[PDB]
């Protein structure tokens, strides 16, 4: 086939590497070479400290015969008369294969599972090549998260971008693990894979992720990319690139429905801000660089659903609003790129509700495309409205009950006061290892809507009301 031709013309030829010993300056995290022969922008080098240790680097700029390298693991210990720099030849590439599911890699793609090298099937550039906006097609069908608060009030059409907004102390890192462990296709595994990327996490959280996925079978599908907090703060902008390149290899060259989860985009933004100041750029608003929107878009918009393939890629970032500031630049810029959001509330966290999701401000902009006959039951699109209305009515009644007492409340508010706490203590409240299918959550939702008489539920269609009400 053509593979046999392209492989040979790519490999089976060797190219020696120049080895320089002309370092002429160190200014913070940057090392400056002096007499380079035809430098190349965005290359990979290999410093050799006078102690025999080895590090990495990447050229940031080039002048007439001059290259500015930045070291990953730090700049301590490098002198100017014994360190040597070697130019690999070209940009960073990830060795990709279809059989790396079940492996764990660190920030720069080096496996840390005490296994062998990946035994690549090809080398891919870790970025670039936007998706042509003529092969895109709109999302359809459902991705079953397995969480009642997310698969009934909201939804995730395969081909969507839904960020999850959290706060500093909230347990988003447990909800992410639960979603990864339970997520799957709505049945009525078998071409479904998950790609997980964790940026700037505690070591204990890394252990938690590793052991949890190892012991629960989720590792037969997933592929982890860890990046601890002591890891070089420049690797933190390579990790999402590697994860997304792997995802869009699997999905668009092996026909798999892939799910991508990225944790703490705020840490990524911090890394970007730090890297920007290394080149002496004047910071934009609130200290973040002015061109961060471009990078966020180039990361988010690598997902979609294309014409000539059966695959797809679904995205689920996770933010951390600094001071619960919806006006902070990070969430604000995330708003213009992705559709919908899931809000995690602190007030419910203190009350002990888990997962502490609140549904009043949450929203999914493509829900109607992943519901109705064919991919779910035919009452989905109206239960998810009746519940939303009655929840707000219950909040209003509970807030006003203490003003005029309870005897000054109509029958509807009286009923809603007892609907609300049952809803928040039996429906939203879900155990960590308790798995619910989209059907036995719709049935539970019905079990709450039968509190009212058949007359009051005035947003459900009469046709729907006729069949499902009485059981």
């Amino acid at each position: 086939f053509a593979i046999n031709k392209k492989a040979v013309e790519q490999g089976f030829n060797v190219k020696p590497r120049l080895n320089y010993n002309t370092v002429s300056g160190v200014n913070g995290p940057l090392v400056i070479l002096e007499k380079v022969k035809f430098p190349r922008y965005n290359e990979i080098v290999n410093l050799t400290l006078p102690d025999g240790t080895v590090r990495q680097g990447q050229v940031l700029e080039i002048r007439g015969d001059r290259a500015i390298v930045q070291v990953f693991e730090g700049t301590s210990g490098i002198d100017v008369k014994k360190t040597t720099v070697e130019f690999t030849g070209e940009s960073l590439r990830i060795p990709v294969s279809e059989d790396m599911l079940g492996r764990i890699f660190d920030g720069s793609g080096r496996p840390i599972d005490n296994g062998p090298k990946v035994f690549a099937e090809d080398y891919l550039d870790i970025n670039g090549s936007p998706i042509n906006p003529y092969a895109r097609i709109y999302p359809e069908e459902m991705i079953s998260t397995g969480v009642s608060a997310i698969d009934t009030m909201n939804s995730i059409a395969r081909g969507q971008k839904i960020p999850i907004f959290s706060a500093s102390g909230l347990p988003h890192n447990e909800i992410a693990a639960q979603i990864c462990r339970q997520a799957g296709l709505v049945r009525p595994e078998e071409n479904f894979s998950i790609v997980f990327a964790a940026m700037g996490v505690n070591l204990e959280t890394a252990r938690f992720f590793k052991q949890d996925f190892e012991e629960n079978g989720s590792l037969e599908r997933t592929s982890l990319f860890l990046n601890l907090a002591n890891d070089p703060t420049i690797e933190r902008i390579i990790t999402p690139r590697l994860a997304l390149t792997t995802a869009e290899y699997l999905a668009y060259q092996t026909e798999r429905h892939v799910l991508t989860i990225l944790t703490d985009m705020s840490s990524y933004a911090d890394a970007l801000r730090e890297v920007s100041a290394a080149r002496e750029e004047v910071p934009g608003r609130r200290g973040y660089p002015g061109y961060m929107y471009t990078d966020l878009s180039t990361i988010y918009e690598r997902a979609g659903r294309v014409e000539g393939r059966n695959g797809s890629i679904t995205q689920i970032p996770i933010l951390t609003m600094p001071n619960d500031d919806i006006t902070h630049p990070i969430p604000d810029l995330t708003g213009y790129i992705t559709e919908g959001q899931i809000f995690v509330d602190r007030q419910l966290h203190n009350k002990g509700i888990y997962p502490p999701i609140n549904v009043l401000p949450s929203l999914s902009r493509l829900m109607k495309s992943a519901i109705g006959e064919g991919m779910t039951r035919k009452d989905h699109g109206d239960v998810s409205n009746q519940l939303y209305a009655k929840y707000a009515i219950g909040k209003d009644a509970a807030a006003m009950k203490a003003v005029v007492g309870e005897e000054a409340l109509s029958i509807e508010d009286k009923l809603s006061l007892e609907f609300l706490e049952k809803f928040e203590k039996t429906f939203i409240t879900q155990g960590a290892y308790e798995d619910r299918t989209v059907f036995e959550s719709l049935d539970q939702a019905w079990s709450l809507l039968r509190i009212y008489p058949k007359e009051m539920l005035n947003r459900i269609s009469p046709k729907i009301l006729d069949e499902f009400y009485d059981r």
Partner: protein, 594 residues
Amino acid sequence: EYGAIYSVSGPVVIAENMIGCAMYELVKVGHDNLVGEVIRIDGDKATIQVYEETAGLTVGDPVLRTGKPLSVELGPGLMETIYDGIQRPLKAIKEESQSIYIPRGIDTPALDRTIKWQFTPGKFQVGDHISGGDIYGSVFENSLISSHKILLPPRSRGTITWIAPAGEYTLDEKILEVEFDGKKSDFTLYHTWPVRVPRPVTEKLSADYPLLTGQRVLDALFPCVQGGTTCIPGAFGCGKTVISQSLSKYSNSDAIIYVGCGERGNEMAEVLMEFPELYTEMSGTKEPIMKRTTLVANTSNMPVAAREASIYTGITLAEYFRDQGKNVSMIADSSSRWAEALREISGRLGEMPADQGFPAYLGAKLASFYERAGKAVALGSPDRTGSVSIVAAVSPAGGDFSDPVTTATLGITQVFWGLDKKLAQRKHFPSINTSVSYSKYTNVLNKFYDSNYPEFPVLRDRMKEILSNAEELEQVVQLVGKSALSDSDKITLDVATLIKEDFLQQNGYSTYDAFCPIWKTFDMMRAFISYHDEAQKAVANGANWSKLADSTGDVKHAVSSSKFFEPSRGEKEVHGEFEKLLSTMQERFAESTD
């Protein structure tokens, strides 16, 4: 070889004619041999940072380079001492120079070379192979720490050739020869280790044992674990300086250090003069507490370059002690005062600030410091296990959530004890905000709880939800007035106030309540929950609470006085009292419904 000075501006010196200097490496500036560290290199110049004060440096003054970075000395004699930022002994300097000032450019061995130590070889014999981290001796330092265990420094190995017998020794008598490619190695009772490279460890573990601070609110709602981080916004109302004595005198710590990074100067004088008089009684009588402590003082006027190099010294000492299977616990004094000096250095060098002037790598600099914490299994032939549990402290510069230091710390810390102005203004101690604070260790602790107190978690959850409901109703009850509240709600109000006044309120300047144990806290917590449930039941069965409160009466006062059962009475002689109190409460509620 010698260079020469070429420029001088504040604490930054630019030597010249220096080729071969590392990126960080101690040098000696001037004729006083001031100690400095190269920061930047370009050609042959070398921007040096001087840890003394530069005054009188003439161009042409020689500059000498040593050839290794900032290193701390580890070994016997680290206890009961007081050090400055870069580990120079203080009282030794004082009684050597006889003055009250610090003579510029003075060098004194960080560990006394004139004290005889008693040595006891381990279980290694000639012809063996020995690797970095193995224990091969034991020195008796105090009665409180009876065995300081010698360690072969990491990055060194080989087969031994001659090991000294037991006897008396000092810190300059070689007691080991190791052959790897030639007997080019002799090992004394100490060594050195760079302060920026974390000590190697065999493998990290998970922390599954609590730290008993003694404050009911912390131990109950937001527990901390042996080998975790923390952040303690404090203003002396929160009790930064009250908990400091508890963490040492009561918590089970085999050792403890203390890093005052930017202290006022009089409060440092207080600490130095009031630790030497504190006493403990763990393990019979081991009266003095300085036999188990090391202190790193740093006044606010010391050279700014030496304020950054303090916490690294502290954490390196803590890691060394951990490497012997102990349980250290740093207590950093002020993280903000450290970031300020770091920003000052960054600005002096010439950089582009991000955010409120900070160098924009503050987060990645703080993370490396914090994540040296945690339990671990040490490196060496005899299996061991130790931990280091940092406890930081931030100063809220106005907004206690907007300053970049707090924002950076909140991303890597596992616990947080926020400060609220209102509880301080009412003089409510300890003043910590339960609405904005968290403890991620509340999950991993149930394995200990269930084997010890299998009811503690649900009680905590009930208390938290009652408290939350209180402030939730606060807005409506203040904007309208308590005139339409139900009878089951006024119960919540008057139980939340009772808890806020007699459970979370504590004063360490007394005897009955200075260190509340865990069983006492559990009993008080159960009693409060039971009282609330009984009141709710009484109203449920039908009775106006306005008069039920009068009918019950003394059962409300008894719980409010439950906080006076002194732990000295024992452990069973309080449990019996609590049992009878609960029984009396139940009977009183049963009989008052008629």
